[PDB]
């Protein structure tokens, strides 16, 4: 078998080739419709049943609507036309939230909607706007004009939310405090005076209504306040609006400095970064009680705090993962983790637990004793695990039929080791603990007895509850729709099952496609965004219906196309999904891009693209021609490209994911080498003498671990924004997977490639580091400290910096430069004929 050597192109020629291949995706990279909502027309004479609203790219990302016919012509395919809802007309905190939420889009990211009035509320640049459609006001037949909510506030307003109790009122955050604003009367009040915008960070570390860094980056919570959904009425003919909010104090949290993007200035910004082992922010719940008079004028605002401290009531809790209100508004709920993230608690909190703030210690003591001893925190659910709690967005609460019982659905992996739905009922006992006695409450004094715990789903497959995956609950037919991996770990599908007498899990989506689904609130329609390895993304509307004989049985029917597939683009040859039995017992899946114009008798160089980190699956039956287009470009130049989902990746249950608990770095490369060798025994064309490995972030981490552990296998390594040292990375992530540094000295040591600099090769042109200079997540220090030890160890490196970039590539010129340098490095040090002579 002779070695194939790639066409040695120059830098200017490779730039040309990369430009021309990218130029056939001007029509492509226009993101699919999302954030769907259904609204009934309620017009017996009219030809439409529903109207749907959604966000999409026409350029900027805006609100559109489309009409749902009462009947269709089943001969032809109806393409729904997109009607513009709006008429045609970044700060630091927007720039950071766009990194925290991983938003690549431009325009409107999200929107609120009050059902009763038709009121849309949305942010768009600095402006907070509103429009009306589908309420009593009726349905427009032409573009509405966005109505700016005017303000006195000097700085950007983040995180707007309509009050569900009263759509005249909104709330937003300005300079880390909660404000409210009436969109009719133009009244604007500040509710919290916790932060002083004019002070430094080092003195003023408090905020209200905001999720701190670790919550945004590691728990996907981007808000810290929650409107109560119902308004209490007063004797005046006025009302009392309520807002639950999280208050933080980051005084004890460490302060790192990140380079400012304005490189000219040669300065640096302070960030509060809770590095592993150190203090997380100090959190607590508070409540704002707002008295409104007859016509919508604020009488008074009372700020209320917990009757006892947060640390006493919710013993053991470090993170408020999620929070909200019950639909009735009687209790405020919250999901609470401990530091280790091995104990979850769902806890109801009555508004009567909150008492007014008073500086006067005489006045304060009268209010404390006036609150009854029966009023108490109610832990309605608790679970532990050896591995870790994965936080998700599934938590549905039913209307409270009986007084001292609460009924709810929740998802969990703590029973079987796979995430499944469970209907639960808890008895809301009066607590054993009494506040009059003047002691602290014992560990389990707030726990509620579990009256019922019926498992709705079960098996060797998981329910999805992240990244938009959730559940719709039809409370009429007593069903629950949900997304899962039951038919395959390579395909997401929409399922339905009864939550009362569970049994038959009925699949609604068509096989051979992975689906992402949004179900109507009325449960008579669902939309699926679907794709596979061959065919690009499509978005279709399906009508849900029951047979007359059995309402529990649900079937679907294609209604219309929202977005049509562009079709197979002739440049893109898809990869072939393979699999293999690893010696660990688990089946590991992979993807193979064979070289284009594969000639027999010749063996080709092999780039192995890698991520292999938790919370991610790279190998599945989805279209990879958009995001991983350049893996095909490598295959077109004559590189074998492999990708393997090793142990630790998601969608295979908790035991599979927990394989690297305490041991990050150590197990992953075995799986990759194993899958890589399985292929080379099976295929004559895989040259194992010339193997590259390349990944970003965790993939960059492993690219270094590969070159460090297995220099025999891997000729070159391209490590993008790698973690070189785990004591630098934040608490929320790294303690979840690796524990506290004290209680895993060796795991941290062996997981940190900067501590093992002498184990890198002493041959140049094998290690290439890439890093964004402005990276606030994986600080540049990881690279700079790694390089510091490489210099002392006498080891060689290659380095490329992207000075306009954080933990992302956003400036297009940076990404063009990256792809160009990558191809040229692979060519000069792996693929080409000259790469062979260099050794």
């Amino acid at each position: 078998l002779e070695p194939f050597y790639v066409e040695r192109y120059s830098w200017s020629q490779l730039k040309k080739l990369l430009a021309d291949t990218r130029k056939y995706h001007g029509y492509m990279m226009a993101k699919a419709p999302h954030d769907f909502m259904f609204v009934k027309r309620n017009d017996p004479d009219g030809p439409h049943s529903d109207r749907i609203y959604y966000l999409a790219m026409s350029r900027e990302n805006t609100l559109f609507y489309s009409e749902i016919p009462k009947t269709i012509n089943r001969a032809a395919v109806l393409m729904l036309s997109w009607k513009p809802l709006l008429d045609l007309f970044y700060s630091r905190e927007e720039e950071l939230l766009r990194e925290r939420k991983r938003i690549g889009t431009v325009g409107i990211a999200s929107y609120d909607y009050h059902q009763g009035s038709g009121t849309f509320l949305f942010q768009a640049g600095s402006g907070i706007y509103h429009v009306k459609d589908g309420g009593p006001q009726g349905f427009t037949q032409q573009p509405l004009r966005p109505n700016l909510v005017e303000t006195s506030c000097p700085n950007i307003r983040m995180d707007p939310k309509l009050c569900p109790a009263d759509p005249d009122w909104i709330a937003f955050i300005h300079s880390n405090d909660i404000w409210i604003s009436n969109i009719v009367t133009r009244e604007e009040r500040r509710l919290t005076y916790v932060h002083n915008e004019l002070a430094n960070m080092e003195e003023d570390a408090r905020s209200a209504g905001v999720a701190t860094f670790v919550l945004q980056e590691e728990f996907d919570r981007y808000s810290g306040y929650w409107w109560c959904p119902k308004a209490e009425t007063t004797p005046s003919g006025g009302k009392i609006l309520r807002i639950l909010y999280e208050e933080n104090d980051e005084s004890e949290v460490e302060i790192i400095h990140v380079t400012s993007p304005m490189l000219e200035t040669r300065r640096a910004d302070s960030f509060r970064y809770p590095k592993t082992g150190t203090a997380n922010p100090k959190v607590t719940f508070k409540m704002s009680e707002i008295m409104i008079d007859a016509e919508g004028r604020i009488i008074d605002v009372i700020d209320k705090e917990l009757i006892q401290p947060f640390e006493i009531l919710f013993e053991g809790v470090e993170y408020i993962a999620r929070a909200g209100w019950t639909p009735e508004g009687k209790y405020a709920w919250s999901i609470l983790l401990d530091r280790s993230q091995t104990r979850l608690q769902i806890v109801l909190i009555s508004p009567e637990l909150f008492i007014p703030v008073e500086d006067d210690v005489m006045e304060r003591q009268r209010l404390i004793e006036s609150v009854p001893d029966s009023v108490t925190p109610l832990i309605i659910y608790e679970e532990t695990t050896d591995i870790w709690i994965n936080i998700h967005d599934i938590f549905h609460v039913f209307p409270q039929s009986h007084e001292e019982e609460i009924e709810f659905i929740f998802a969990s992996e703590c029973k079987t080791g796979f995430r499944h739905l469970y209907k639960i009922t808890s008895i809301l006992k009066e607590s054993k603990y009494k506040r009059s006695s003047g002691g602290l409450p014992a560990p389990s004094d707030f726990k509620c007895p579990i009256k019922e715990e019926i498992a709705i789903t079960s098996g060797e497959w998981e329910v999805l509850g992240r990244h938009g995956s959730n559940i719709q609950v039809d409370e009429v037919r007593r069903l629950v729709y949900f997304e899962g991996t039951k038919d395959s770990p390579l395909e997401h599908h929409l399922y339905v099952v009864s939550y009362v007498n569970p049994g038959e899990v009925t699949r609604l989506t068509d096989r051979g496609y992975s689906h992402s689904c949004c179900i109507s609130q009325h449960c008579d329609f669902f939309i699926s965004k679907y794709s596979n390895q061959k065919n690009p993304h499509c978005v279709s509307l399906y009508k849900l219906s029951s047979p007359e004989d059995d309402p529990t049985c649900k079937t679907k029917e294609f209604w219309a196309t929202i977005l049509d597939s562009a079709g197979p683009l002739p440049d893109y040859t898809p990869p072939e999904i393979f699999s293999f039995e690893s010696t660990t017992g688990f089946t590991l899946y992979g993807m193979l891009y064979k070289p284009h114009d594969l000639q027999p008798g010749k063996k080709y160089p092999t780039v192995l693209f890698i991520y292999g980190g938790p919370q991610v699956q790279l190998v599945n039956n989805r279209f990879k021609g958009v995001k991983y287009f350049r893996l095909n470009t490598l295959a077109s130049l004559g590189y074998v490209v492999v990708v393997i989902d090793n142990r630790g990746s998601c969608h295979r249950g908790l035991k599979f994911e927990g394989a690297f608990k305490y041991k990050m770095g150590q197990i992953e490369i075995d799986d990759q080498v194993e899958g890589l060798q399985y292929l080379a025994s099976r295929y004559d064309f895989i040259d194992l003498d010339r193997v590259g490995i390349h990944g970003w972030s965790y993939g960059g981490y492993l690219s270094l671990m590969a070159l460090m552990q297995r220099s025999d296998i891997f000729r070159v390594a391209i490590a993008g924004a790698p973690v070189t040292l785990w004591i630098f990375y934040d608490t929320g992530y790294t303690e979840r997977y690796m524990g506290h540094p004290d209680q895993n000295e060796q795991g941290y040591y062996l997981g940190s490639v900067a501590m093992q600099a002498e184990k890198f090769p002493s041959e140049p042109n094998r290690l290439l580091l890439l890093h964004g200079f402005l990276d606030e997540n994986v600080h540049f220090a990881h690279t700079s400290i790694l390089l510091s030890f490489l210099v002392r160890a006498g080891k060689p490196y290659d380095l490329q910096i992207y000075p306009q970039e954080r933990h992302s590539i956003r400036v297009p010129e940076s990404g063009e430069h990256y792809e160009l340098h990558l191809l040229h490095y692979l060519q000069e040090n792996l693929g080409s004929r000259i790469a062979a002579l260099k050794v």
Binding site: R102, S697, Y698, Y733, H807, S808, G815
Partner: peptide
């Protein structure tokens, strides 16, 4: 999380 983002296209 250790998840890089590629959303800078031409």
């Amino acid at each position: 999380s250790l998840r890089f983002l590629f959303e800078g296209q031409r």
